Structures are given as structure tokens and as C-alpha cells.
Amino acid sequence: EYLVSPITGEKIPASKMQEHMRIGLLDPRWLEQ
Amino acid sequence: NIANTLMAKALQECPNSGILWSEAIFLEARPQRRTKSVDALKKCEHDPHVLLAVAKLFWSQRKITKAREWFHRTVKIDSDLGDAWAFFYKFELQHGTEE
Amino acid sequence: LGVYLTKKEQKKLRRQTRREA
Amino acid sequence: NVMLESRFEKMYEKIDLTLLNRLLRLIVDHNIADYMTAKNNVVINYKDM
Amino acid sequence: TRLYLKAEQERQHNYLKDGPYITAEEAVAVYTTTVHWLESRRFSPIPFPPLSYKHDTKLLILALERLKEAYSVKSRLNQSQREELGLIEQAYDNPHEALSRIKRHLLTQRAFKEVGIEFMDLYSHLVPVYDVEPLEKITDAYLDQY
Amino acid sequence: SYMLPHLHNGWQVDQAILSEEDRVVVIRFGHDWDPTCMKMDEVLYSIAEKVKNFAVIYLVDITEVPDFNKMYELYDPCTVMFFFRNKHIMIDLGTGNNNKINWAMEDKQEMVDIIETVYRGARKGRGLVVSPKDYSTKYRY
Amino acid sequence: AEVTEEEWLSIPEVGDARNKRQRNPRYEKLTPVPDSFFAKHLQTGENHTS
Amino acid sequence: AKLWDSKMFAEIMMKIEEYISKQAKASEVAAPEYRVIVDANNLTVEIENELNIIHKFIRDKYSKRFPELESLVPNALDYIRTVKELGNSLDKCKNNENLQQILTNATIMVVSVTASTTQGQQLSEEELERLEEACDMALELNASKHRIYEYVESRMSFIAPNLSIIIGASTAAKIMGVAGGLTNLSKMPACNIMLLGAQRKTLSGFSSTSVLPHTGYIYHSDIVQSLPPDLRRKAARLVAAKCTLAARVDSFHESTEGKVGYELKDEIERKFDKWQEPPPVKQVKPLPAPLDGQRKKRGGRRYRKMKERLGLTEIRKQANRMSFGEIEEDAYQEDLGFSLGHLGKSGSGRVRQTQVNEATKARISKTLQRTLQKQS
Amino acid sequence: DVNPKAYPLADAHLTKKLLDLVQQSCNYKQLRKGANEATKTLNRGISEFIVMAADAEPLEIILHLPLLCEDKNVPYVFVRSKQALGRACGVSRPVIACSVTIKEGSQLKQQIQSIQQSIERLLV
């Protein structure tokens, strides 16, 4: 099953889209702290 | 169950119907969750013996003061049908003090 | 088909875009 | 003549809340007395405990 | 303070499991004495503060002034103190809404937030100092004045 | 007491004074078994983590290191010496002696007070700082 | 003496119970009293004439 | 009178159920076993629907002797037992052992105090052939309810295997009998399943928190009570949620071996021992180092408002000035050393009174004002 | 597909319209997420239609919803993934049941009536 990523517009597996939305919006300044 | 389905269908058809809304809470709804059905019926502003249904629900809950207040409200022009007056007479005759 | 991300991540993504810019 | 000067020892601590409510309903309506005796029953909190 | 509060925990837990220490007989005796006294004095019960009360704001004004007397002499304020002064001055700004809130609290509020405790030492005994929730202090003060 | 780092010979304490530039070295000379030294070697415990940014605490047993007794007058049971960038920071107390705290105190705030005052006066470049509290008495009454 | 060699390795490291907003509070600003007190104090100190 | 005749058919049905349950003790040593549970549940619902009306009749008939006791004893069976025990003469309340087995000592003393001040009058002998008959049939109906309670508890190892393991068959029976059956409570949200058998206990001059408010049979279950009092509510919500998750399974009779029930129990226990897990390691950050000479700062509307809030208001700055060689009467008796100086002083200052500022007005926090909005 | 016990299970054509209606009701504050809230709406009689997911492994936790709809004469339909339904409802967490309530003079009346009509002709 394939879905469409709301942020990148690319085919994604339906099983991962939850953590895909959790992690693809990972806040960039969080990395330094 | 057939009666419950029929009552639900009747409520779905013109829910503003005073008689159906008044006779729903007291007949189909169990004493538990009857108060929620009473509030849902009271969501309809008109009270053609709907206030009488609220009074009956209060009397079932054994609230003497609430039942008397609702009956006084029911016996007014809002529910001026003779059923409200008869219920008020019966409740006053059945009141704990009966003065 | 696509999915509709919620308002929380709407605000988060808008904040990312503006801070990025 | 004799004259006694004492104090009700531990008067504050030895006040039973329900009995206090019953006594208070005599002078004030039930709601205010119930509010009083509910306010008395409340968690006391120090730095930690 | 730690030792006294441990002893207080002991006493409260003892009361909870042992029930009331006052017997029904003595309670009935005290209560009937009180009711006989009040009937002999022809004392009418204190009515609830009505929605329309002539002295309604006067009592609120006195309660707010009393609550502000604790800060009348002050140079620096903590956060809780600032919030308290804000509450009294807001209730002064909108007396009607504040009094409606007070009536609602008196009529339907029975669960209260924890009230802090500390002790002031007189070097002979310890006097307990209770800190009450800033909003509930206003209601309590108005009730006291009324 | 036993928790704080210990120095065993004369070279180590001089290195500890020299191996730091941006903090203050607070050395508790004395005997960790002394009732006096153990009274304040727990105060120095309770604040060692708090003052990590601008203070490091080393302990020294004068019997183990009998090299600074004569020069720094190590004959009171307990002594506290503050060093900054290899410079003994004199501190003016209420007591006559202005080079050491030769008594063990009790409050964990006052010692941080003194250490921070020493650091503040040492960043400027002073040699004698002035304590906030006066120790010409004990404020007992 | 009869504690196993692994059980000493299985000792748990205790931690603090209080949260960040009570272990490490943000510095509490200390503001002056509102100046309405200075006015009210003198206002209370004025009397009528009749 | 009418209620007693009404229970006659219910009494015959209860006798039939008793015969079936006694046979169930022999048949378990074309009329299947599950129907003997379903009809028994219907019968216990009916006996409750008669207990309520007989309790109402008792309250109506006994209000002549003591009109306040119903407002003090909320529970039905407690009310029947209390009116059966007290009798017409209320002098049987002092050191009464059987009152204690029904009522809390606090509510014992409140009802005794009310019995002291009673405006009710004694009942005739005719009232004593009605109230005692009603109390006797009430106790009989309670005995029947418990005698079918034990049978339902025994058989929920089969009828509802998933629900009977999370909470235990006893509380399972207490929550399925009162809900009107497994099918009834399957249509019931977990929030309502929490309040199953939630007595509206009359607070005896206490905080409503002391007498558990909004507490149901699920809150009195063995699983939740094992937890500390603070976590019980949070545990009650979760356990009732998993209870209805298992209930919806048991309604349609799936996972009769309890796989879903065991999974839900595992989830509950995992959440429980996650809640009871000790706090982790928290580092003690050191105090910040003393600051250096200077640091650049921003400035704008925010800095302007900060300077306005902390600026020397003219009334404040006028109070700091304290004159010279001008004794003044010590204002504020309760604490001297509080002199306003030139504020309101004839020594110097402006001819007009120093007008009060508005920037220094006390203000409440944003979150506290949010609490005010929600509370109202 | 995955679950044979899927009576009104809809395909990938009107699922898009269903999710669009769910999002629009979210923007209008016109849905109740969750099985318990859907059941409460059905009990109150104000629910117009409820949509659940066929991915909840113990489907009987939500198989009382079609029975309740049958009692109240309410349209009901399934979907193929709980994650999509949850995300469309306006929350990140997987939702297995949502309800759409009533509104006086609602701008969504035509679309909700169309959805009710579409589901009611798909039961067989």
C-alpha cells in the first residue's frame, strides 16, 4: 500500500506514514541541543 | 427493541415533534440515562407536555421539590393541556405533606 | 492517495519554513 | 468568692467536622455551612509532604 | 515542623480509622442544648447572600481592603504576591462578576486546592501559618465579613 | 569529606593550584577525621556540584603533606585557602586573620557566598576581597 | 556477606522526584509594589470636617 | 400493597431461577446453559426495578415519622435497613451495634443528631404492617440478588472469559448485572462504565474529595486498589477502557480462551508498572558563574515597557525623599518606620497632589486569567 | 480484504470524498472522534453517520457500532486503514471510529446528505 507524503509529495509505504510524519518534520534546531 | 427502533426512527423524523419527544424519555429511555434524554427533549424550546415529561422524570427520581416546581411550570400556559392539571392534582394528593 | 496532516504539524511546518527563511 | 481562669485545651484540634457542620446549619443555611466544613477539610502541604 | 507534621499525620490517620471520637450521645446532648438556646433567643437563621444585596459591595470592599492590608506595607513582591494583588484589584474593578463568582463558589464548590503550611517560631511554641489559594482567599474573606 | 578529591604529596597541591586558570581553588587543609574539619567537609560536599562553574575543591591532610605548615601557618585544626591563577586570594573577615577561614561553619549558603565573592574580586584582579558577612561575633544573642 | 557479586552490579541509581519547574525554577522577578498603595495610604489619612 | 402483589410474579420467577441454579449445581457436576444466565440476568434486572419502587414506597410512607433521613442515607438498601431498625421511636440509636454494620460512624452521628430534632410524628399500627412488610421483602429481594450474584460470578468464567479476568468475576458480575446485560454495556462508553454503581454518597460536612466523588464499581475493584491513592483515578480510567474493550469482544463471543483478555491485562500491567517506575537520574546543574563587565542588549517596545514598569513613578520617587529636620506623626501605627516622606508633606513638592500612575497597576498572569475564563 | 467481517466496506473511490467530508467537518467543528464518542452521539440521536476502520485487529471492539446504527437508522461505512482515518479526522493518532453530528443551517448539509445516500445504496 502506497500513500503520498504531505510534505515531499513522494510515494511512501502506508505502514511508515505515521512515524514518517513524526520524523520528517524533525525540528532542525533540535539537533544541536 | 422493535419499539426502541421505532422510537428512534420517529425522533429522526421531525424531531421538533412535542409528543414524540415528551414520550421518548419516559417510555423508551431507561431510568438510567433518562436525564440525558430529558435534556435532549428540553433542547427543543417548545414544551407541549414536554415540561410534563420533565416533571414525570423528576417525580420518578423522587425529587419532591423539583417535581412540584416542574408541575407548576407544566400547569402554566406552556403545557396548558388538561393532562398537566390532572398530573398536578395527583401529585399534590400524593405529596408527602398533602397540605 | 495522500493524507491530511493535522493543524499541529501545520503550525510546526509553517514555523520551520519561516525560521528556515 | 472563687475564680477560675483556664482555657479549652486543644480546642481547635478537637473539632469534629461533621458535628461542626451540624452546629453550623443551625445559624446559617446548609450550603454555607457545607462550604465551611469542606474548606476545613483540605490537604496541608509543607515543603515536601 | 517535620516532627509536628509527622505527629499530625499520625493523629489524622488515627481519626480516619477510629472514626469520630465524639459519641452520638454527647453529640445529641450538645446539639439539643444549642437548639434549645437558639430557640430561646428567638434567633432567625442567617440567610444566604442574595443576588440583590444592598451591602453586597460594602462587604466585598472591606474584604478586599483586609486582604490588601497584608501588602499595604511592602516594597518588593514575589510572583504569587503580584498575582494576589492583581486579583484584588481586578475584583475591585469588576465587583459584580467577582461577587457572582463568590456566590457560585459558596453554592457549588466543595473541592479545594492544597493550602500550604509553615511555622513562625516564638521560641516558646510554634504558631502555624497557613497560605490559602489567592482566589479562594477573596471568597473566604467576603464570607467572613458577611 | 571522603567524597571530595584528595591530595597526597606536596607536588599535587601545587599542581592543582597551577592546573586551573578560570575558577577558584578552595583547599581545605587539615585532618578529615577532626570533628572541626568534618563539620565543614560536609558543607564543602553539599556545594561542590553547585560551584563547579567557578570553584574546584581539593582536600589536603597536613600530616600527609607536611610542606605548607610553616609557610601558611597550618596549626589551627581546620584551614580554608582560596587560590586564583596561582595567587593566594586574601579575604577580609571579621576575625583578625585575613588569609584563611580557620573555623568550620554550618550554613551551605554562606560558603557559596564567600566563594562567589572571591571569584568576583579575583576576576577584577584584586588580592584582598571583602566578605559580605562580618565575623567579629557569632550573631547568637 | 551473602549478597551475590551480580546483585551489587544490579543496584539502581536513585534519581530526583521533583520536576524541572520545581528543581530549577526560572529566576523569580521581584517587582515593586504598585504605586496605588502610596496614594491609598495618604488617602486614608485625610479626614472630613463635619 | 400493589408493589407486594407485583413482586409475586417476580417471586415465582425467582423461585424458578433458584430451581434452575440448584439444578445447575447438579447438572454441571434444548434449554442450554447460557440461557439460564440470560434469563437470570433479566430476572435480577426486574427485581432491581421492583426494589426501586418499593424503596420509593418506603420513603413515602416513612416520611411522616422522619422526613430528613432519606437526604442523609442515600443508598436504597441502607435506607430500608435503617428504617427497619430505627422504628417509630428513635431512641434506639445510642450505642446501637446493627446501625454500625449499615452506616458510617459519621453518618450514624448525623442521623442521630437529626433524630434529636425531628418534626415527624409517630406512626400508627397500620403503618407498621406496611413498612415492615416492605422491608422484609426488600431484604428477601437483596438475598435473591446475591444468590443469583454468586451464580453469575461462577459462570462468567464461561459467559465472559475476557472481562472476568481483567477485573475478576465478582466485580464483573457487579458491573454486568447493573448495566442491564453484556449486550447493554457493550453499547456503553467506557466513561459511563466507570460510573456503574457510582453511589451519590452524601458528603458528611467533608471535602467532596474525601468521600470519593464519581467513583464506580471499577474504582472499587481489586486491581485498581492495589495502586497508590493518587494513581487510582488515572488507573480507573485505563482499566475501565480496557474493560469495555474486553466487553465488546465478549458480547460477540470471540477469543473465548482469553487471548484478547490476556493481551489487555498485559497492557494494563505495563501501564501500571510504567506509572510506578521510579524517577530517572536528574543532573544538578551548577550555579551560573558571576557575570563579566558588559553585554550588548536589545531595545524596543518590549524594553520600553520594561522601563515603564520598573521606572520611578513620580509618586514613588516623591516618597523616597524624606525631608530634613521635620518631625512627622508616625503614620501606620501597626508598623512605624513607614513614612511617606515628601509624599503629602507640607515641606516641599508640587502644589497639586501627585497623580497616580497607570503603568504600575497590578496585573494578573495570562495562564491565571485563562483559569478565570474556564472557571466561569 | 484483510477482514471478511466488513459489510459496508467502501473502495478507494468514495473514500476520498469521505475523508474530504471528515476534514471539512473538522474545520467546522462537526465531528466526534473515537469509538466512545461515536457511541455517545448514536445514543443521543444526533449522529448522522459514523465511519470506522477495518484495521482494528479485534474488530468486535467496534462491531457494536453498525448494530447501534441499525437500531437508530444511521448510515455506517468502513475504510481500509485506521491511520488515514485518524490523520484525516485532525489528529495524528490512529482512530478506528469517528462520528459526524448535526448543525442547524450547516453548509455541509448537501454533502453529508450525498454521503448518506451513497452509503445507503452500497449495503448489498
Tell me if F129 is assigned to some domain: yes
Q: Is I7 on the interface with H (CB under 8 A)?
A: no
Q: In 3D, which of E90, E63, H361, H354 has the Cα closest to residue G42? A: H354
E131 forms bridges with which residues in the sheet? E116
Name, in order, each residue with C-beta under 8 angstroms of H322's C-beta and a sequence gap of 6 or more: H339, H341, H342
3-state helix, strand, coil in chain G (%, to 5): 35, 5, 60
CA dist., res. F111 & res. C14, Å (int): 50
Please classify residue D45 by burial: count the beta carbons closer than 10 Å to its beta carbon, then call 0-12 exposed, 13-18 middle and 19+ buried.
Answer: middle
Reduce the secondary structure of I5-44 to three states and give it as a string.
CCCCCCCCCHHHHHHHHHHHHHHCCCEEECHHHHHHHHHH
* Pair E106, E49: CB distance under 8 Å: yes
B38 → chain I, closest CA residue: I44
Residues after which chain F has a gap (C–N > 2.5 Å): none
Cα atoms found within 13 Å of the Cα of residue A29, Cβ hemisphere only: 6
I64–H187: do the CB atoms touch at under 8 Å?
A: yes
CATH of the domain at F118: 3.40.30.10
* Pair H185, H217: CB distance under 8 Å: no
I81–A21: do the CB atoms touch at under 8 Å?
A: no
A6–C12: do the CB atoms touch at under 8 Å?
A: no
* Pair B96, H121: CB distance under 8 Å: no
Q: Is I44 on the interface with B (CB under 8 A)?
A: yes
3-state helix, strand, coil in chain I (%, to 5): 45, 15, 40
> Taking CB atoms and an 8 Å cutoff, what residues of chain C touch I88?
3-4
CA dist., res. I108 & res. I30, Å (int): 9
C6–I84: do the CB atoms touch at under 8 Å?
A: no
F66's grid cell = 607536611
**Min Cα separation A33/chain C (Å):** 17
Encoded amino acid at H218, one letter: I
* Host H or E run for residue E137: helix E134-145
**Min Cα separation I73/chain C (Å):** 30
I12–C8: do the CB atoms touch at under 8 Å?
A: no
Domain, as residue range, for F57: 2-136
* Pair G38, H315: CB distance under 8 Å: yes
CA E114 from chain centre, in angstroms, equals: 13
Q: Is D11 on the interface with E (CB under 8 A)?
A: no
D45–E43: do the CB atoms touch at under 8 Å?
A: no
Encoded amino acid at H71, one letter: S
C5 → chain A, closest CA residue: A6
> Taking CB atoms and an 8 Å cutoff, what residues of chain A touch C10?
none
Q: In 3D, which of H110, H102, H101 has the Cα closest to residue H69? A: H110
H284–F51: do the CB atoms touch at under 8 Å?
A: no
G35–H278: do the CB atoms touch at under 8 Å?
A: no
> Taking CB atoms and an 8 Å cutoff, what residues of chain H touch E20?
105-106, 109
CA dist., res. B91 & res. C1, Å (int): 64
G32–E79: do the CB atoms touch at under 8 Å?
A: no
Which among H60, H180, H192 has the least Cβ separation from residue B96?
Answer: H60
Name, in order, each residue with C-beta under 8 angstroms of G1's C-beta and a sequence gap of 6 or more: none
Helices (H) and strands (E) in chain C, counts: 1, 0
A6–C3: do the CB atoms touch at under 8 Å?
A: yes
CA dist., res. H162 & res. H182, Å (int): 12
C3–A17: do the CB atoms touch at under 8 Å?
A: yes
Cα atoms found within 13 Å of the Cα of residue H146, Cβ hemisphere only: 6
Which among B31, B33, B62 has the least Cβ separation from residue H59?
Answer: B62
> Taking CB atoms and an 8 Å cutoff, what residues of chain H touch I37?
189
Q: Find which of I43, I49, I70, I103 to mutate to test the B interface (most B CBs within 10 Å of its CB).
A: I43
Way the structure was solved: cryo-EM
CA dist., res. H89 & res. H96, Å (int): 14
Tally of domains within chain F: 1
Residue appearing with cell numbers 388538561: B82
I64–H251: do the CB atoms touch at under 8 Å?
A: yes
Q: Is A33 on the interface with I (CB under 8 A)?
A: no
> Taking CB atoms and an 8 Å cutoff, what residues of chain A touch C1?
3-4
Reduce the secondary structure of chain F to three states and give it as a string.
CCCCCEECCHHHHHHHHHCCCCCEEEEEEECCCCHHHHHHCCHHHHCCCCCCCCEEEEEEECCCCCCCHHHHCCCCCEEEEEECCCCECEEECCCCCCCCCCCCCCCHHHHHHHHHHHHHHHHHCCCEEECCCCCCCCCCC
Encoded amino acid at H15, one letter: K
Name, in order, each residue with C-beta under 8 angstroms of E36's C-beta and a sequence gap of 6 or more: none
**Min Cα separation A32/chain I (Å):** 26
Tell me if F34 is assigned to some domain: yes
**Min Cα separation H239/chain D (Å):** 27
H286's grid cell = 551548577
* Pair E133, E125: CB distance under 8 Å: no
Q: How far apart are the first and last CA of chain E?
A: 34
Residue appearing with cell numbers 558543607: F43
Query: At how many degrees (to 10) do helices H33-62 and H2-27 cross?
Result: 150
> Taking CB atoms and an 8 Å cutoff, what residues of chain H touch G31?
309-310
> Taking CB atoms and an 8 Å cutoff, what residues of chain H touch G23?
282
Backbone conformation region of residue H207, classed left if phi is above 0, alpha if psi is from -120 to 50, else beta: beta
**Min Cα separation H70/chain B (Å):** 10
Give the other-Cβ count within 10 Å of H246's Cβ: 29
Tell me if F8 is assigned to some domain: yes
Three-class DSSP category at H350: coil
Q: DSSP secondary-structure letter at I59?
A: G
Q: In 3D, which of I80, I118, I105, I117 has the Cα closest to residue I30? A: I105
Q: Resolution limit in angstroms? A: 6.9
Helices (H) and strands (E) in chain E, counts: 6, 3
Residue appearing with cell numbers 480507573: H236
Encoded amino acid at D46, one letter: Y
Q: Find which of I68, I69, I73 to mutate to test the B interface (most B CBs within 10 Å of its CB).
A: I73
**Min Cα separation A15/chain C (Å):** 13
CA E55 from chain centre, in angstroms, equals: 20
Tell me if F141 is assigned to some domain: no
CA dist., res. C21 & res. C14, Å (int): 11
Max CA separation in chain I (angstroms): 39
CA dist., res. H108 & res. H99, Å (int): 7
**Do at least 3 CB pairs under 8 Å connect H with A?**
no
Across D1-24, b (16+ Cβ under 10 Å) vs e yields eeeeeeeeeeeeeeebbbbebbbb
Alpha helices in chain H (DSSP H): 2-27, 33-62, 69-72, 76-86, 97-100, 105-116, 125-159, 163-166, 169-178, 182-186, 190-194, 222-225, 232-251, 259-275, 301-310, 314-320, 366-375
H237's grid cell = 480510567
A21–I83: do the CB atoms touch at under 8 Å?
A: no
Name, in order, each residue with C-beta under 8 angstroms of B70's C-beta and a sequence gap of 6 or more: B51, B52, B54, B55, B58
Residue appearing with cell numbers 438475598: H143
**Do at least 3 CB pairs under 8 Å connect A with G?**
no
* Pair E37, D27: CB distance under 8 Å: no
The CA-CA-CA angle for residues H239, H243, H249, to 5°, reads: 150
Which among G31, G36, G40 has the least Cβ separation from residue E82?
Answer: G31
Task: Give the domains, in start order, of chain I with CATH numbers.
Answer: 1-124 (3.30.1330.30)
> Taking CB atoms and an 8 Å cutoff, what residues of chain I touch C6?
87, 90-92
> Taking CB atoms and an 8 Å cutoff, what residues of chain E touch G41?
72
